[PDB]
UniProtKB/Swiss-Prot annotation, chains A, B, C:
Subcellular location field: Secreted, Extracellular space, Extracellular matrix
Tissue: Expressed in xyphoid cartilage and chondrocytes (at protein level).
Function (record text): A major component of the extracellular matrix of non-articular cartilage. Binds to type 2 collagens and forms long concatenated protein networks as part of the extracellular matrix. Required for the network-like organization and bundling of collagen fibrils surrounding chondrocytes in the zones of maturation and hypertrophy. Required for mechanotransduction and adaption to mechanical loading in cartilage chondrocytes, resulting in an increase in expression of the extracellular matrix components ACAN and COL2A1. Acts as a moderator of angiogenesis in response to injury.
Parent sequence residues shown: 451 to 493 of 493
Organism: Gallus gallus
Subunit and partners: Homotrimer.
Name listed for the protein in its UniProt record: Matrilin-1
Coiled coil: 16-46
Length: 47, 47, 47
């Protein structure tokens, strides 16, 4: 349930979700830089 | 072409683009969790 | 150090950071579409 009068334009609700996209995006570049580390692992036997 | 008077501070245009970053980011973590599934596929023959 | 009166609700500071998430997210899907290209490279010897 949520109120229906406060929060005019999410002055902090839109930037609040932004921070969630800040840590989430970082986690994506994390599993990505690790995926490239596993690919080289296979290049050690596929080279 | 876009109007030049309405939309004061994108009260919904900035949060509207945010939702696009919500599904787009999810798709990134999707091709990422699948990339790790393909890496293990190679680990089955590189192990 | 930052002022403590200007910038009411980041009318352009929240959307300004959004653009940073626009190019960053693209870079994530970039290393991702390249990671899948390296995975197939291993599938050429693991197939």
């Amino acid at each position: 349930g949520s109120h229906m009068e406060e929060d005019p334009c999410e002055c902090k609700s839109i930037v609040k979700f932004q921070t969630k996209v800040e840590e989430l995006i970082n986690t994506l570049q994390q599993k990505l830089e690790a995926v490239a580390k596993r690919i080289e692992a296979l290049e050690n036997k596929i080279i």
